[PDB]
Structure formats: C-alpha cells, structure tokens
Amino acid sequence: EVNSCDYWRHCAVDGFLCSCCGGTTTTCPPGSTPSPISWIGTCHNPHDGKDYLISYHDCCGKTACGRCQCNTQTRERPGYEFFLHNDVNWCMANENSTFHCTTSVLVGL
Amino acid sequence: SLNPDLANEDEVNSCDYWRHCAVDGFLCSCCGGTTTTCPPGSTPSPISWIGTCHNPHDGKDYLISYHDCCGKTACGRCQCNTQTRERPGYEFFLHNDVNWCMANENSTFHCTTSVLVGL
Amino acid sequence: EVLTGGHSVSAPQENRIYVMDSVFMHLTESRVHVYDYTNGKFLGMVPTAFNGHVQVSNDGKKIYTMTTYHERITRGKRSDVVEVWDADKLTFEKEISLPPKRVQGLNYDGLFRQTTDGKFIVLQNASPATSIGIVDVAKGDYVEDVTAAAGCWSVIPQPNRPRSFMTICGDGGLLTINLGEDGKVASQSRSKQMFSVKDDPIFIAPALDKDKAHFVSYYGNVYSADFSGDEVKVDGPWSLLNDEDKAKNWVPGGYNLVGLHRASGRMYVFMHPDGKEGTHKFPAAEIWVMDTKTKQRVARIPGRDALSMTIDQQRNLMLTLDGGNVNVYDISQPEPKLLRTIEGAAEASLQVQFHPVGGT
Amino acid sequence: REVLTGGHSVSAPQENRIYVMDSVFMHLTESRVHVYDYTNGKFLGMVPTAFNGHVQVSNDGKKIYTMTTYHERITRGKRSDVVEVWDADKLTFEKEISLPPKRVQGLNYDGLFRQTTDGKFIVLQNASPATSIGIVDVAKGDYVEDVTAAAGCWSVIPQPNRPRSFMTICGDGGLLTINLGEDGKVASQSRSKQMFSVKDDPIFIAPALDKDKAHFVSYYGNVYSADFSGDEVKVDGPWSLLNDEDKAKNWVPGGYNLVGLHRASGRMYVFMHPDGKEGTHKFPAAEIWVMDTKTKQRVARIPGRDALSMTIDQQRNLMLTLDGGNVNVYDISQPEPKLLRTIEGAAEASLQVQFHPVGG
Numbered sequence A: 001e002v003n004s005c006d007y008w009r010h011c012a013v014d015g016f017l018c019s020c021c022g023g024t025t026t027t028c029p030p031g032s033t034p035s036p037i038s039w040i041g042t043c044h045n046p047h048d049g050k051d052y053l054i055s056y057h058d059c060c061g062k063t064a065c066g067r068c069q070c071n072t073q074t075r076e077r078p079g080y081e082f083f084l085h086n087d088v089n090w091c092m093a094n095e096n097s098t099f100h101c102t103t104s105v106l107v108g109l
Numbered sequence B: 001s002l003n004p005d006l007a008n009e010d011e012v013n014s015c016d017y018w019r020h021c022a023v024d025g026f027l028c029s030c031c032g033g034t035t036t037t038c039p040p041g042s043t044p045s046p047i048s049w050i051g052t053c054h055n056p057h058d059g060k061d062y063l064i065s066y067h068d069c070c071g072k073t074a075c076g077r078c079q080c081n082t083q084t085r086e087r088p089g090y091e092f093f094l095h096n097d098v099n100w101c102m103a104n105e106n107s108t109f110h111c112t113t114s115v116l117v118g119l
Numbered sequence C: 001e002v003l004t005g006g007h008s009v010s011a012p013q014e015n016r017i018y019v020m021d022s023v024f025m026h027l028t029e030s031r032v033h034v035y036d037y038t039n040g041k042f043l044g045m046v047p048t049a050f051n052g053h054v055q056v057s058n059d060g061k062k063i064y065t066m067t068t069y070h071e072r073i074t075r076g077k078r079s080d081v082v083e084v085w086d087a088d089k090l091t092f093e094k095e096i097s098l099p100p101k102r103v104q105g106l107n108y109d110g111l112f113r114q115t116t117d118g119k120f121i122v123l124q125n126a127s128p129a130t131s132i133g134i135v136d137v138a139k140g141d142y143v144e145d146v147t148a149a150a151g152c153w154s155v156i157p158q159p160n161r162p163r164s165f166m167t168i169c170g171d172g173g174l175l176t177i178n179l180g181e182d183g184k185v186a187s188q189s190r191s192k193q194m195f196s197v198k199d200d201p202i203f204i205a206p207a208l209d210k211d212k213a214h215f216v217s218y219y220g221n222v223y224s225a226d227f228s229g230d231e232v233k234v235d236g237p238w239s240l241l242n243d244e245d246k247a248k249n250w251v252p253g254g255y256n257l258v259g260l261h262r263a264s265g266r267m268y269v270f271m272h273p274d275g276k277e278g279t280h281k282f283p284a285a286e287i288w289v290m291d292t293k294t295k296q297r298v299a300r301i302p303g304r305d306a307l308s309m310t311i312d313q314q315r316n317l318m319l320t321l322d323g324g325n326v327n328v329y330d331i332s333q334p335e336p337k338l339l340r341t342i343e344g345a346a347e348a349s350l351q352v353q354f355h356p357v358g359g360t
Numbered sequence D: 001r002e003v004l005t006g007g008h009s010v011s012a013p014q015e016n017r018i019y020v021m022d023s024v025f026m027h028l029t030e031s032r033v034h035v036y037d038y039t040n041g042k043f044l045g046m047v048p049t050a051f052n053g054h055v056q057v058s059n060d061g062k063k064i065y066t067m068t069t070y071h072e073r074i075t076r077g078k079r080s081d082v083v084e085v086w087d088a089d090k091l092t093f094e095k096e097i098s099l100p101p102k103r104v105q106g107l108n109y110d111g112l113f114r115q116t117t118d119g120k121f122i123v124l125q126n127a128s129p130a131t132s133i134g135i136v137d138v139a140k141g142d143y144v145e146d147v148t149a150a151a152g153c154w155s156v157i158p159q160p161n162r163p164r165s166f167m168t169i170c171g172d173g174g175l176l177t178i179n180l181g182e183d184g185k186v187a188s189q190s191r192s193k194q195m196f197s198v199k200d201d202p203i204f205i206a207p208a209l210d211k212d213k214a215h216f217v218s219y220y221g222n223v224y225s226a227d228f229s230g231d232e233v234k235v236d237g238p239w240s241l242l243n244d245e246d247k248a249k250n251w252v253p254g255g256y257n258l259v260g261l262h263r264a265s266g267r268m269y270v271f272m273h274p275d276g277k278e279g280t281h282k283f284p285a286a287e288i289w290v291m292d293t294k295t296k297q298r299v300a301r302i303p304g305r306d307a308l309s310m311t312i313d314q315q316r317n318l319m320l321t322l323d324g325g326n327v328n329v330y331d332i333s334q335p336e337p338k339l340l341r342t343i344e345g346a347a348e349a350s351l352q353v354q355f356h357p358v359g360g
C-alpha cells in the first residue's frame, strides 16, 4: 500500500515515491542525499481519524527515479506560503540539486 | 523520386522512404530540417555511415550518406531503425549502431539525414 | 546533394509558439519545442538542461532561457544561468551568470519575466529564502537581489510602466518594486491585504491587463489589483459562481490557469466541478469566459483536460495545453472557437507562449 | 518522530542483482543503469550515466564501472570522456578516470566496455572514427595504453582462461589477440587466419563465450568458432544452425547481444526469426533456439517474446532476455528453458542486461 499515490501519508507528494525507487518512506535510495529542507503537509489518518504533519523531504543528487509519480495536493498552497508548496524542487539547496524522489516522513500530530 | 523537397512531406518523413534504408535515428525532415539540411542550430557531421538503397521509382541503386546533425539534444520525432546492407563495426563506415556525431565539436546526437551521393 | 547547417527557422515569427517541455521523467534534458500554430509543424528546439524556464524578448529577436548546470550533472560545481539565444537561428549567443539560487520548479509564467521596456529580466530566487533577481540585458550582468521581496512569490510586470513589477506576499497583499535605470530598487510600496491567505488563497497566475490584474481563488472568487495610480488599490472578492455553479461545487484548477483578453475585458479560466480540498491543480472540465466589467460568465466550453493557457492580444487567440497537446482557439468573439490541436507537442509541459508580435 | 536518513546500501544481496543499461535514447543525455532484484522484480536503485553511458560490474563484485561523456554545458563546451568507479553496495561515485575524447559512442553491445579476466584492467573500444582499444589500470585510476594495432577491428572478447588477454574482430575476417603485461601495456599479440568472409558471411560481434573458446553466429545462420586453448587462436566454421525445414522458411539470427553459452553443457542460445532477408539482422526474436555446440545440432526451440538481447549466469543456470523494456528470467538448468517471470518496465530503451558477478 505505501507504493500507491492514495496511501494516506502521501497526501501532498508532487514527485516519485522513494519507496518505489529502492528506498522507503523514510530512507533515501542508495546514493541519493536527503534534503535538509522540505515542504510539509497535513494528512488525515484513516485509522484513528487524526491529522498528522508529514515532512516531504526529497532525495537528491541522482537523476529522476521515474517510478510511482504522484501529484496529490491536500492542503497544498502556492509559493507565498512557501513551506506548504510542492511545485518547487525541495532539493534546491542540496550540494547537488538534481531531483531523485520524494519521501513522506511522519513528524507527529 | 530523387528530389525529396518536391515530394510529399508524408512520404519523405516515413521510415519506408526509399533513401532511408540504413537510418538508425530521428529523421531530420521531421525535426525542423529537411532531408539535406540540419534543423536550426544543429551542425552536420563531417563523417557518416553510408548505405546503398534501391529507388523503386526509377529502378536504380544509389549511394546514400547518413550524416547526423549534432550539438542539440535528441529530436525525438520519426525514429527509424532500418538496416538494409548495414554491417557491424568491423566494416565501420557501413555501421549504424554508432553515433556519427562522434567527432563533432559537440557530439550530442540530434537527428539523422539521408544525402544522395550518386549511382 | 550536400548537407548544410546555419539555417533559420522555416516559418515566420508570427507563426511560432514555444512549448516548454520539462521532460519531468528526465528533467536534466528539458527543452523548448518551437511549433507553427497555423499548421502544427515542428520547427526546432532549444535545449535547456535541468528544469529550464523560457521567455521571448519583448522585441521578438531573442529567446531567454534560465537553467542549472553542474560540472558532472549529479555532482560538481553548480552554475545557474540565463542564456540568450537567437530566435531565428535557434543558436546560443551569451551566458549570464546567476547566483546559485534561481527557482527550480514548475513553469509558471511569473517565475521568469521581464520589465515592460525589455531592459531587465526579472526572475524568482529561492535558497529557500526568497528574493527577486534582476538581470541587465544590455550589460549581460546580474545586478543584485531584491531582498525586499522576502516571503513573497512570483513576478507580475506592470505593463503601464517601463521597469516596475509586483509580487504576491505572505500577508495577502502585493509588493510593488520600481527599478532605476541601473536595475537597482529605486522605490517600492506595499498594498493593503487583498485576500485572506488562510480563508481564500489565490492562484498566482494573473489575468493581466495594462493597468490592473485579476486573480482567481481556490474557491472561485476573483480579486483585483489596480495599478493605474502610483499606489496599488486592491478589491474583492467577487464570485465566478452562480447558485447552480455553487451547488455543483465548481472551482478553478490548473497551473497557468487564467488569461485576459485586454480589448474586451474577457477573462478565461479553467474550471472543474466537485471542488474540494486538494483539487486546485485538476485539469479543466471546462473553460469559462467571464466579462470582468459586468462580472458575469458569457461562455463555457469543454476544457479538453487543459492545465495551462496563454493569450495573444494581437491575433485574438488562446492556446491551451493539457501537458502534451496544444489546442488553438479563436477568441475574437465571446465564445471561443477551436481551430486545431497539435498532438504530442511535449511530454510534460505546463507552459506555452506565443512569439511576440507588436506589443509596443 | 521519524527521521530521513541517507547512506544506505542496496537492500537485496549481490547475488540477486541485475543491471539494466537504459540508454533512454529519446533523452540520451540522461542514460542510466537500473538495478533490479531478478528473484522478485523489485527496483533496488540506479546509477546515472549522462550521455550514452556504458556499464559493467567488476569481476570481484565490489564496484560498478561506467563509461560516459560529459561537456561543460552538455550541448556545448569542453568534452570529458571518463570511466567512473562506483561502489556496488552504496551506489555512490568514488573515482573518475580521464579518457582521451574518443570513447565509443554507440549502442550497448557487451564488447564495447569489458575487463581482463583478473579484473585489473578495463578494456574499452575507441572510435575517432579511427578505431583503437583503450586500457585503463583500475588500481592506478589511469588510462595506460592505446592499442593502435587494433585499427580496423571492433569489440573486445576477453579470454576467460588467461588473466589479461582479449581478442577483437578485424576487417580481414580474422581475430587479433592482445596479451597485456601486468602494467597494462601490450606484452604480445597475434593474428589468426581468416575465420569468416566479411563480404559473404558477416558475423554478429556478440560472442557465445566459453572458458577456452568463443562461438559467433552469422547473418545467414552459420556458426564460426575461435579456440584459444593455446597462445595462437585456431579458427573454424562454418556449420549451419539450420536444417532443410529451417532453410525453407528462411530462419536467420537477429538481435543485438543475441547469443549466450551455458558452459557446463555447451548449449548455445540464439535469437532467431523466420523470413530472413537483407536488413533483418536486428529483428526481435520469434524464437530462442538452443544448440548443442558439440553435436552441432539444435536441441530445443521456445518462443522469443520479441527479445533483442540476453545474458547468462552460469552458476545459477539462468538466462535473461530483454525486449528493450521488459526483462524475462529463464531457468536453463535443463535443455528447455523455463520462464520464471517477467519484469515489466525495467527500462525505456535498453539493449543490455547483466548479472552481478558471483564467481570472483
């Protein structure tokens, strides 16, 4: 279920799911580097009915994974609310900004 | 049959057009160029593979030089992979699985042309 | 026969459009595809490396691209640049060095613009702190960051002034920047709150007139910024929606999702039914045509799943783009008329633009 | 609270891994190697390889070697041809080795980028377009020899029975053997007698390689052999793959990396198609034929699944086949291959797949 765009934690992913790319939801595929910065989403947990903060750190420094492309936009907002915005490359400040895939890191309630 | 510019565009832009018999690549005539002119901002290769193609319209065989156009990224249109009389790399100038842009100032492959040399 | 290069684009400038292909699946090989809108013919292309952006010089002679290189693509030193290309030969002419923070992101028009006088390129930076970058076209130089635009996003040129532009800020207002002849900030001003960021967020894409801009919101309201005077006056909301529209939850959706036909005041907007949180980038079920003076819808037509558009004021045309295919419309009358579709113009484009004609 | 981490190794053991070299011909500047687990089809990772990359895994299984071309600005600027050494488990870049700017740019035949049996030297094909063979000393990270004696020859066939010897196919229809010294310089060489007629019965370059001999198939379905049990290569052939029934339907070989040998049995695998004529030598397989190279007779035939390239793993008795996009996994422990699974969407445009080495 984690490799589907409709998995609940992926509600503001614009990118390739890292779990389909040799990584997991919280680990970068081998040889790709986490972004220290990210957009954040608030996603509804369908089990407990509570909303959770998800941090969408990208994995960077390798060319596009190309698998499990998603474009979900729950509570996403334009660049004037920059850290809620997912039409920018969150690898933009990495040593190498080439975008590989997006992770869905659970922060908390 | 010898002058593609006077022919039907749809005819010359087809992989089955008689003079495209050893093309591996994108036809330049679909890429903003013509059979004998590189698309704007791409550079002809000074070297090429050569194929021999039969012209069914006039019954004669012609030497065709497959020069590439170079220094722009892949055109992506009208990809062909025809292999009449094509041979492996130990007959190097008959071989079309190599980039004939290989000696250009910029070797990035854009598209392939089919230039009529003669009988 | 002899193969030659050095050739110009085969169709005249007034026939040309530019489809910015991000090639997201292979984003390091983005490019601009040049097409003839009158017959669908592919005319040529400009390579733009990683996540290129593109615009045409106001005078129609050059193509400006913005991109990022690294010495070894996925490793090595970064170089962010603007490139100047000749429009007719589709050849590289000049590289202008930028600081390594040009915006990397989807191709909204407002990320890469120019002043009305064409003397400055005006681009969005994100480090991720935001600022606006200014490039002096005549000098081939970066000037300096417009630091005043921190916490703001995107560039809306004021077509009634030579070197002024606005940006949308996190307080729901607009910041206006007026450049001097050297490209440095000569003055600035900040409007009152236009929209509630929390309750009625707007799309950044302006429906841009000569002295005002309209913006649509996530809930189908309209806001305006009037910059006829030295200070910007803001207004709204008014609704795009009648009761029937509201009962079926029609809202706007797309990327470069609006356009203004300036002579008539008609605003074009991509819309879809069954709106809710998360549908703001949905493809167009329909295109609505709004009279901005009477504030009523005058037409509605099938959207062809379009996401982005552009308007030509000089030929009374609208292009729409669904990511891969470009639709050409005649908008000389209230109801648009579909002329043709150019199939396979891109693999992943969210931006199309005409070659400028006139516009002085 | 979860924390995102990097630095991880490939999640499956080396013995499960295969390497699909994706040319991405439509966007050839973003070629890459995709790493898959053949046991379950899981995607494990990838290595970027820029323009028209080639790949091989070190014989000891510890490193991945790539060969590629960069330019300072991709489509302009200074060219850099390189070999890169990558860690096989971390899929990270370690070292760049400079090459002269003439490495072969072309489709991914195995024989364009190889290594000596002892693993100490990388042996690669150059074309400027004049041909030569380049030698890279892995330990030193240096290009150490350029074998100009191989002018007019093509491709590299390592000899598995000698530590630093390989052969190449020459324009005279014979083989040139090169024996490198421990410094990577040519220590000796020899030329065979004519093996095949270049004009009348051209061979495919792909070897069906045994420990002490190699077999080649021809455009017309003949088989040639090169026995290198001694210092001088002994050549023979042709024998025909075809019986009279096969000839009546015009069966011939076709593909790219189109043959393989199971060394324990002597079985040779070949992609074949009916209705052969001039120009069909790269056609997808209608069938895979299984030949007994000792008796010089076919033993089995199975559907080809439109495959173009293959590779064999000796120790697990496996054959992979590849149709450009999908990888089929076969068990070849018995004379009839058995299809175990298909990995769909392994590449967009691949003509080469390879197993991770397990021999050492």
Ligand SMILES: *NNc1ccccc1
Pocket: A013, A014, A015, A056, A058, A086, A087, A088, A089, A090, A091, A099, A102, C104, C105, C106
């Ligand atoms: N989420 N990462 C991303 C988004 C948009 C473009 C490039 C990368």
Ligand SMILES: *NNc1ccccc1
Pocket: B023, B024, B025, B066, B068, B096, B097, B098, B099, B100, B101, B109, B112, D106, D107
């Ligand atoms: N014909 N030019 C060509 C062929 C194969 C690869 C790249 C270019």
